[PDB]
Predict the structure.
Amino acid sequence: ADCAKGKIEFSKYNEDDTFTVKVDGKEYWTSRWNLQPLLQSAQLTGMTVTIKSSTCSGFAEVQFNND
Amino acid sequence: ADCAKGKIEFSKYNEDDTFTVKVDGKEYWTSRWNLQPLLQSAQLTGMTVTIKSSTCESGSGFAEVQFNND
Amino acid sequence: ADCAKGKIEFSKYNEDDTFTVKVDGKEYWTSRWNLQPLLQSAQLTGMTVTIKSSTCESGSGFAEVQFNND
Amino acid sequence: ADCAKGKIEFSKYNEDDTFTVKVDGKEYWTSRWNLQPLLQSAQLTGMTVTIKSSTCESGSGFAEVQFNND
Amino acid sequence: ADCAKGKIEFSKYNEDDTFTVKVDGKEYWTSRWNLQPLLQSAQLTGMTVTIKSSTCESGSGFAEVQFNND
Amino acid sequence: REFTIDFSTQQSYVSSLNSIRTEISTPLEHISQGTTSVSVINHTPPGSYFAVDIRGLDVYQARFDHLRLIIEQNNLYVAGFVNTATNTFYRFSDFTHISVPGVTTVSMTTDSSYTTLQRVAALERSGMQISRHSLVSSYLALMEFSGNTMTRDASRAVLRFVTVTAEALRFRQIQREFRQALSETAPVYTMTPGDVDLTLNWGRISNVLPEYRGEDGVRVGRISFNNISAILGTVAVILNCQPECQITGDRPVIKINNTLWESNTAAAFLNRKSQFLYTTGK
Amino acid sequence: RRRRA
């Protein structure tokens, strides 16, 4: 399911080495480290991200689109 | 074969840690970890890439890609 | 607690492979290597960062940080 | 030997995970994992790179590269 | 001690797994791979870097460096 | 078209440069105050050039007056130099498409790249000194020059004259810094690393500034501008975005936190993978 | 291609 679609409103590196993003007013986190630079880049360049997951908590699938 | 040449239309990080790009209307996935940020930077700047694979149908895998200056 | 919020005034790689940032006049260091390039990108782009820690004395460690655009 | 000095005309991620750049009309590959983002950054900004290797024929490998601003 | 302060004039990766930068006319090297993307980004964005070391001999190693936007 | 650059005084020098810019370029709508702007070179067909007559090396004196520069109009490159006493055009090897009627064209083995010129000149541009005195020495070297291959002294002369003509046309910063050397004090202008970086980033700057709409800043690789006065104080003439306009990709800019970034610069520091994985995957 | 003068 497409859990959230939009711009990253903020990102956060967490003490447990996960990474949180807020998208369309909802917070989601991922434990996949390579998503940390990918998400921060999307946030900086204004990409639309689509957080995807079987339960929309944690995610490990996300689509990146230029604005 | 050279399957698709053009700009990355979207990219996607996948739950199996592979990474998908759509080029010339077709989707391709790679398990090469190092390609993830290289492809995303190509995407954000509009770099043309050439996806190279044994099969060129959308949904094919690749392990080889050329970053062009066109 | 929110120890400091603002732009990164400088960053510094340290000989023990920790990484220091100065935010709102206070210095904090992290041993999380993953944060080094992310904090550099934030610094380069004028991101507003929020250092979060249970110890907020300058010179203290941190491993939680929020990144905001304008 | 100084094999090539110029801008990166294209880069390629190879099936064996090495990384190829074309500089001054010749192709050079490197297995050095640290160089992949650095070489793409050079290509993106049109940096002049100096490829040094014991052989300079197109298709030679390298591990030594200088990144210049001019 | 502050060995050198300025923009990075060039950077270079050597066959012997050292990474040289030239700052304010002086060359220094580091084998911390953490510092390669940090230093190259500093170079390509024009940050002012401050190389720091206990001893600031020419051609000596370093693993402490401050990054400033200006 | 023919223009004079008169080195007699700061007034005559800046007046000369301004006149050239007015004729060959058009102000950007969004970077213009009074008649002081960042301008875009007007399109001319490939191979079009203008001539620059060098005057006033000896303040207000009709002497040292046989040097002319041939400048390709679309890119402001110096294609070569004319000795008008011998009616000879010494043309760099990368400008065989530039045809000048009425002169004897000497096609040179030397190309005009700064790399080549600095090598032959045994002179780096960073730290290069230019004074009225060394412009006179440069003039004399160029009028003594003969043959198809640049000598050391002719290359030093071209480095100095290109800096104070074409590079000053491009960069008001270089105009402002160099022009102090023309005063009665006769100080030395020293080309700075910042000056050099500006000249090396001219194409990239040219691709970015047409997109400026009053953002708080502009970032193009190593180049940063923090306000319109910084832009205007630094840049005067840009390419019409020419191959120098594009490195790779097709996105001139990204607006990030009210700063206009060259997209390729941002891409070049946003292409790193996870740091721990990078450093341990040796 | 390197910067031309």
